[PDB]
């Protein structure tokens, strides 16, 4: 999905293995905040949110808590106390088109900043001046969305990148999303300290 229309997937009751993703060189960016990226499989939270979108390379640095810019202010804002991970990878071979791609958009103007995890897809004409726009674009009246125009020949800073932000939400409810929790071999007839199911 476009960055301004970021898609959200809800994850309840499913084991996941963040070790095969952390060990993958395919992902150009793997940065976690509030939780160590190494120690990830042990953690347990009741729900998981997966926000997904596409940006350009120069904006990948903007997907982090406490950041500012077009994307952070007008497209996708992360809270300061965000507890989760941000993963990004170069999608030039998929989301770039010769002549420029028109499918991925981003909000260019907005009168106020987005709240954390807010989703704004309004196409109201931005009034930059004192004269009120009446639905028609013009001087000081611009369309809020702009196309990235992703091309395969673009610079890697302007090439398309697919970004997925995983957040782990714990509420006043049982924790239903759990890690792999691998096991080991068992030995008999020897004094052992054991850890069975619970």
């Amino acid at each position, epitope marked *: 999905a476009s960055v301004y229309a970021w898609n959200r997937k809800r994850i309840s009751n499913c084991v996941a293995d963040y070790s095969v993703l952390y060990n993958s060189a395919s992902f150009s960016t793997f940065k976690c905040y509030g939780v160590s990226p190494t120690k990830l499989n042990d953690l347990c939270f009741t729900n998981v949110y997966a926000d997904s979108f596409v940006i350009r390379g120069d904006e990948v640095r903007q997907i982090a808590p406490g950041q500012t810019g077009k994307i952070a202010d007008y497209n996708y804002k992360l809270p300061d106390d965000f507890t989760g991970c941000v993963i990004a990878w170069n999608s030039n071979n998929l989301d770039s088109k010769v002549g420029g791609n028109y499918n991925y958009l981003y909000r*260019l*103007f907005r*009168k106020s900043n987005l709240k954390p995890f807010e989703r704004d897809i309004s196409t109201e004409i931005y009034q*930059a*001046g*004192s*004269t009120p726009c009446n639905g028609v674009e*013009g*001087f*000081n009246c*611009y*369309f809020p969305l*702009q196309s990235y125009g992703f091309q395969p020949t673009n610079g890697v800073g302007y090439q398309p990148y697919r970004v997925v932000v995983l957040s782990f939400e714990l509420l006043h409810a049982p924790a239903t999303v759990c890690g792999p929790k691998k096991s080991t071999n068992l030995v008999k007839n020897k004094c052992v300290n054991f850890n069975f199911n619970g």
Partner: antibody, heavy 123, light 109 residues
């Protein structure tokens, strides 16, 4: 120092191209617009065209739709005007104009103007 | 296209008199998208009036503006020696943003 500085004088042969620069200062370039206007020696002002800096959208006059292309580069806060297939009729002084703007709003007219760039085209 | 016509061609006036310039559009234009500029020989244009009736920054208060639709007026209450130059009116609402042909204000003698 809300400034708008243009290129120096240009002297080109007929059939060539000239690219006039126009650099902004003082205001936030990213949210403004830049127009280009020409004036022949002792003549009136002839509007060439304008560009929105944030989007890059351009509108040209009928008489310059064919040989003028207005561009911009927000990194170097500079806008350019490329004029292809020069001829003696193009010998004039060229101005760039822009409203000064802060991070969110703009002025309601073209109050910042460049010093002018004289382009002479002959053999 | 919107055609901008200015008058008079040459305004021969004495320093201290009241100057009055006219600007006519071939079709009705927005008052909030018309400007008046001053240009001296060998100099760049200087913004005088915008929004038909909004004085610009640094422009003396003797410059005024009025009009609506197709007819607009630039009024100089008391003409100063530093005011003798060329004056243009431009509409910037409907593209192309055409200019006028200019008005030369000379010192009468």
């Amino acid at each position: 120092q809300v400034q708008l500085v243009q290129s120096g004088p240009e002297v080109k042969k007929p059939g060539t191209s000239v690219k006039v620069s126009c650099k902004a200062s003082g205001f936030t370039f990213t949210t403004s617009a830049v127009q280009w206007v020409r004036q022949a020696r002792g003549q009136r002002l002839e509007w060439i065209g304008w560009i929105v800096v944030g989007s890059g959208n351009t509108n040209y006059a009928q008489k310059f739709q064919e040989r003028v292309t207005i561009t911009r580069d927000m990194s170097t806060t500079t806008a350019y005007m490329e004029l292809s297939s020069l001829r003696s009729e193009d010998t004039a002084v060229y101005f760039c104009a822009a409203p000064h703007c802060n991070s969110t709003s703009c002025y309601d007219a073209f109050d910042i103007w460049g010093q002018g760039t004289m382009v002479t085209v002959s053999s | 296209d919107i055609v901008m016509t200015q008058s008079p061609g040459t305004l021969s006036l004495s320093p201290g008199e009241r100057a009055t310039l006219s600007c006519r559009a071939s079709q009705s234009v927005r008052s909030s998208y018309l400007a008046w500029y001053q240009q001296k020989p060998g100099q760049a244009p200087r913004l005088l009036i915008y929004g038909a009736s909004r004085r610009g920054t640094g422009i003396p208060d003797r410059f005024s503006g009025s009009g609506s639709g197709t007819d607009f007026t630039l009024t100089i209450s008391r003409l100063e020696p530093e005011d003798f130059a060329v004056y243009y009116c431009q509409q910037y609402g409907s593209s192309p943003w055409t200019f006028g042909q200019g008005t030369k204000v000379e010192i009468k003698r």
